[PDB]
Symmetry: C2
Subunit: 238 residues, 2 copies
Amino acid sequence: AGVTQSPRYAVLQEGQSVSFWCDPISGHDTLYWYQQPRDQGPQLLVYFRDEAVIDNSQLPSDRFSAVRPKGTNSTLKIQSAKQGDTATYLCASSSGVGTEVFFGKGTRLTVVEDLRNVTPPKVSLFEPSKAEIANKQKATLVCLARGFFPDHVELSWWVNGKEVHSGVSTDPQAYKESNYSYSLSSRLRVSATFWHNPRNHFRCQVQFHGLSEEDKWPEGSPKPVTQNISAEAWGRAD
Amino acid sequence: AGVTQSPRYAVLQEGQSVSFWCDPISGHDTLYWYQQPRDQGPQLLVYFRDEAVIDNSQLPSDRFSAVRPKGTNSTLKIQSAKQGDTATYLCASSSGVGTEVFFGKGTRLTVVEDLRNVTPPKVSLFEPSKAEIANKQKATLVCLARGFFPDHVELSWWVNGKEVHSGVSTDPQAYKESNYSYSLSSRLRVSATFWHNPRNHFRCQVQFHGLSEEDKWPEGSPKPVTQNISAEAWGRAD
């Protein structure tokens, strides 16, 4: 799409390390890494030209390194993560200083006290009311996700196997039901006639970014890896 | 997107009925329904202006009806399905005769001898070779789906929870391993560096269009409803 970063999400326990990986516009000269804490503004970590750090004193501490050994791909590493490192890491690229910057989508990082706390959502779909259908000739489905941790979920809607965007409304932020428990919801509005066709299939899908295969799971419970949890319903003949 | 049809896929047993539903461009005058058998061309079933059938003698038999009672949405019904009805049903819309036609995506219909035969795929992901990675600096994943019936599957690739299209190559047609058994495969090519990051997540997703909730399942086995079957893998540090 332009600047591309991997991964999109990462969850670590205090003390671990993560390497963020960025890949500037196929043709580009300057590359910036930024750290942006949740409710705060972006802080420049470091920037390169071709393959050389231009300004280094930017790096907030010695837990951070960045390299761009051949002048294209860059990797920003954090060792010894602190909860303090929790933030979105933004890559950007540019042609020359001051010439309109171009920004990545970011890599979201959460560092927790204990990976044992990571847990996927339980997802529930609530059906439209008869009163809406008849009075508004529209039908609104409600998706509820809760019990997850951390806040690394993306919710989408699927109608007959094809994603839909128009008619959707999703809470912007997950809600903190507790210490290690979030909650989030979304609405899909469709037409009366559409809901009334029992060959019509509706699915709410929650993508959860959890543990990687490389994370060791001290076991017992099912390991809370990245996974899709869905709830669905079929249209009803009234 | 323009002309919209529901559902996208349907599987019936001989003797049942299906109603296809179409919704022309929000502003449109003429509406056509076509039947297009797999290896053949489109045959006009019927067309309307506003809310009236213009030409009816088109309908191939009395098992078919179409209505457009208020002049917008149309519904084409088949009773007493035959295997002979297996085909893609195409909706199209137009302003006036001969003025460049605009076509829907279609509704794919398969009528079988027995719904008991409907069965979802088993899906397998095969990892890249070390030789490709080192020699080509690229890594190609292989997705295999088989054992499904009927031919109502869509395969997609997901990398860190985001769909990807560039680098994909999917067989155009499922392969007929047997009477009631299809097979299909796909390749995703990514860069060496990308595969080598163990925070990178790769998923092959097969969407299967099966039975609806309204279809009665004579039971025993898990009912082969519409469902997503996935196989995934995480990047490996070499």
